Design a protein around this ligand. Structure first.
Ligand SMILES: [Cl-]
Length: 116
């Protein structure tokens, strides 16, 4: 899986369409632990504690159906302790320290990982 770290802080939608606009891809869609580690390796120097990825807790009310923007299936997740319920927004963000996933509010401006 090819992935590119963009260091500019942008909202989720911004990042999503930024990946599509600049590199013709999407926000990274992680499907195993290897990619999660390599992506964790690429975000070991980021001061920002989190980075956006393609995850979406998209559910009408309380359906809370995790889904990737890229459309790929949702078969893997590396959730942090005390996650991912009763906290956070609708958009997922990978914690730079450790590599565990979080739930963040989409309007937050954080670095992101573009796939290509
Ligand atoms: Cl939100």
């Amino acid at each position: 899986c090819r992935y590119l770290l963009v260091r500019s802080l942008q909202t989720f939608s911004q990042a999503w369409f930024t990946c599509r606009r600049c590199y013709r891809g999407n926000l990274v869609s992680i499907h195993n632990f290897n990619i999660n580690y390599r992506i964790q390796c690429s975000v070991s120097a980021l001061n920002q504690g989190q980075v956006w990825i393609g995850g979406r807790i998209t559910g009408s009310g309380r359906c809370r159906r995790f889904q990737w923007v890229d459309g790929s299936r949702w078969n893997f997740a590396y959730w942090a302790a005390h996650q991912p319920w009763s906290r956070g927004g609708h958009c997922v963000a990978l914690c730079t320290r450790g590599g565990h996933w979080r739930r963040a509010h989409c309007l937050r401006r954080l670095p992101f990982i573009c796939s290509y």
